[PDB]
């Protein structure tokens, strides 16, 4: 007989850092001789320099498709009234100059030789407007932006659409409009208190950080290993002992480097196919539940889906999923089937539920009950063939309209 | 790639410096990525910030209604 | 193209090798270049299971879409085309495969009026499936993907609640069919 | 099921509509008015 | 199955290389054997991941 709207949020990786690496740097740096060791293992630099290069593409592809989803950058309006929503915590803030929302602020400000870093194709500010752009069109066109040109919906009428389409009829929300302003707007305060919290809340992409930094540590730290050599010294071995036994300590400190090297290159790989996994998983609840309604249950939130704002995260991405929840039940008596004349009644969309003296028929998922009236009834066979069935008359308005 | 090319048309980027382009004050659509935002093309080679796309503003009335 | 690569051996011709060399030499340049070709084996199967398990994830991606967007219709938006997806058309490609998605894109836009709900008699009517559109005089109903209006009639408008606790509504008679019935 | 007006609804004309075919469609209350 | 290999070795067993061979090609012997050791393992690790 009620409902409750509980806001959850969700965290998505979208693109991890690119790296890419020297080989004559980070192996031999500037000893000649090392340089001219490493042409006799054959073709080991080019493959590992594709393999970084087709790494960093797929990384920028991932990173590009899972924002860029539509051709226009939608302006929100100046006003920020829609019918008693607050819509601060998510929508830009023009005094900050950084374009940043202040719940993408708060995430923002919760995370932390041979070895260069390549930055991203795109930086904060674009996956910003990306964001904002996305906000505006779910927020003053609906989920049509998503097909084709925007249509100016009202977002009342686009919340009764969504309120339809998980089957309540339109006749619950325009009555208490206020309360669930009211619902919302806690939701998104105790979302916005509740998402500093916890240090953990911001879990992979806090992980993801950390994985790549120090798996560059470790690349770097394999530079001071003597690999069952005298030292881990290029200029040393050289200068100090004979050029045969130097020959055999630069070989095996230079596989030794080039077996980190492959291993650092696995690893990478592994972790950009597991970032890419996750980046379509994001990219499809990008397309499904912000794009749309999705119909899934248990697939954005923990609840009946209405709608879903996105909010920009450095390499990943935050979900802000509205569920429905309908909290504080209340049971009754029901029939599958009423008889009258001899002839069976069915409901046309919703159950027969008794309070216990009198019938009435209401919605599957909120208490409204009506009485039984020919127009929302249909009536198929016979009364004996169905099972459960009872006795009651039904309500037709001709009775009365044919007298009168 | 992330050299200071003051010891070596120059324009520095986030990414580094581009020699052999000049710059553009209005955006095209690129098809060249390079990074933070920086693309390339040729129309000579000209390098521009990246279009975000098209600047279109909607209006919103909650007493009015778009039907197709 | 790793063949032709010495790996520190005397030469990368396997024949020569043995051929020219004692086998208490020959032992160790068979273990470098056995050790070498071993190393770029495993560099190549490791890359050929990393690309095939792309291919399976690939295709297990496609056979989801086939089996959502060709055997039947997919109700949610943007998974097969732009814009609402009615059926699509599978193709036969060398090494992969190429969908014929069929689109429904509206067009045409129009600006219009509305309103929630309309008041009369003291209750509010609300309607089946459309909404209330006024074109600047009188009211009509349609569809939210197309226009199409219709006389606000009694059949697919509902009433609910009373006229106080709803907002934005506005004022108009409703046409009920069963009243010029019974007058002829 | 008896095709009335109830699970049906009227549109356009008569002109348009290929493949339409001829027949008298029931209307309920119609032995109830007269009655 | 990969433990008890020779890998290009004198022997596989630790205590028959570590005693009968003179301990400056010894210890490249057992450098060469858990070096294959170690490879097998970064190989099984990579079945796995
Ligand atoms: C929605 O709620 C937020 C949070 O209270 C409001 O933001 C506050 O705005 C006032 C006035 O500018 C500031 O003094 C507060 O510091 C802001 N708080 C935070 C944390 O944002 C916002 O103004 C409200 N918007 C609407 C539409 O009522
Ligand atoms: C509805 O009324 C009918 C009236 O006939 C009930 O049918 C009778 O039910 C009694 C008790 O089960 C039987 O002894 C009779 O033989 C039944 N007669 C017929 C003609 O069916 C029916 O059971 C009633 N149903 C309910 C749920 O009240
Ligand atoms: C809004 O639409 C209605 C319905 O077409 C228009 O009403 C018609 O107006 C013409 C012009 O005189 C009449 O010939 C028709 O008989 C009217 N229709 C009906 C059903 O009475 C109305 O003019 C339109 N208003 C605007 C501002 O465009
Ligand atoms: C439903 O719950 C809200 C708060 O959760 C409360 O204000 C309201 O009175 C309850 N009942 C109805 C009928 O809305
Ligand atoms: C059941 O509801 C009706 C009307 O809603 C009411 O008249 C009746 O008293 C109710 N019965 C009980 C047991 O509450
Ligand atoms: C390059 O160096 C000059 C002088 O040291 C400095 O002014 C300039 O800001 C540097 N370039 C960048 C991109 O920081
Ligand atoms: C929404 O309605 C309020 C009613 O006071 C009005 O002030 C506001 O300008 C309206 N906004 C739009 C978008 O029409
Ligand atoms: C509808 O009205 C708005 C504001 O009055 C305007 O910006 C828009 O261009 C109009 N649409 C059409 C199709 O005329």
């Not at chain 1, 619950?172 to 619902?183: D, F, S, T």
């Not at chain 1, 009506?370 to 009651?392: E, K, L, Y």
Request: net charge negative; charged share 15%.
């Amino acid at each position: 007989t009620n409902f409750t709207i509980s806001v959850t949020t969700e965290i998505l990786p979208v693109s991890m850092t690119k790296t890419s690496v020297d080989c004559t740097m980070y192996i031999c740096g500037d000893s000649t001789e090392c340089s001219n060791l490493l042409l006799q293992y054959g073709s080991f630099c080019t493959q590992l320099k594709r393999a970084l290069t087709g790494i960093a593409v797929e990384q920028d592809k991932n990173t590009q498709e899972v924002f860029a989803q539509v051709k226009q950058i939608y302006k929100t309006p100046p006003i920020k009234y829609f019918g008693g929503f607050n819509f601060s915590q998510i929508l830009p803030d023009p005094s900050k100059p950084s374009k940043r929302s202040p719940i993408e602020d708060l995430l923002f400000n919760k995370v932390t030789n041979g070895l260069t870093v390549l930055p991203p194709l795109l930086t904060d500010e674009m996956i910003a407007q990306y964001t904002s752009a996305l906000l505006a069109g779910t927020i003053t066109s609906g989920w049509t932006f998503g097909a084709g040109p925007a249509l100016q919906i009202p977002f009342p009428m686009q919340m009764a659409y969504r309120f339809n389409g998980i089957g309540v009829t339109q006749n619950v929300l325009y009555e208490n409009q206020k309360l669930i302003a009211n619902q919302f707007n806690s939701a998104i305060g105790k979302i916005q208190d509740s998402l500093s919290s916890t240090p953990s809340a911001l879990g992979k992409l806090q992980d993801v950080v950390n994985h790549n930094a120090q798996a560059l540590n470790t690349l770097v730290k394999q530079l001071s290993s003597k690999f069952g050599a005298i030292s881990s010294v290029l200029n040393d071995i050289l200068s100090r002992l004979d050029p045969p036994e130097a020959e055999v300590q630069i070989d095996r400190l230079i596989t030794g480097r080039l077996q980190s090297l492959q291993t650092y290159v696995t690893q990478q790989l592994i972790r950009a196919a597991e970032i890419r996994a996750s980046a379509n998983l994001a990219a499809t609840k990008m397309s499904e539940c912000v794009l749309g309604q999705s119909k899934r249950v248990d697939f954005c939130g923990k609840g009946y889906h209405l709608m879903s704002f996105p909010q920009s995260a450095p390499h990943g991405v935050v979900f802000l999923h509205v569920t429905y929840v309908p909290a504080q039940e209340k049971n009754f008596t029901t029939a599958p089937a009423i008889c009258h004349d001899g002839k069976a009644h069915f409901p046309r969309e919703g159950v027969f539920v008794s309070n216990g003296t009198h019938w009435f028929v209401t919605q599957r998922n909120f208490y409204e009950p009506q009485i039984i009236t020919t127009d929302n009834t249909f009536v198929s066979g016979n009364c004996d063939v169905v099972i459960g069935i009872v006795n009651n008359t039904v309500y037709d308005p001709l009775q009365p309209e044919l007298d009168s | 790639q992330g050299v200071n090319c003051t010891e070596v048309n120059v324009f520095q980027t986030r990414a580094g410096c581009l020699i052999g382009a000049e710059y553009v004050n209005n955006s095209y659509e690129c098809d060249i990525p390079i990074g933070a935002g920086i693309c390339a093309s040729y129309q000579s080679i000209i390098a521009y910030t990246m279009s975000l796309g098209a600047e279109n503003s909607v209006a919103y009335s909650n007493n009015s209604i778009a039907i197709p």
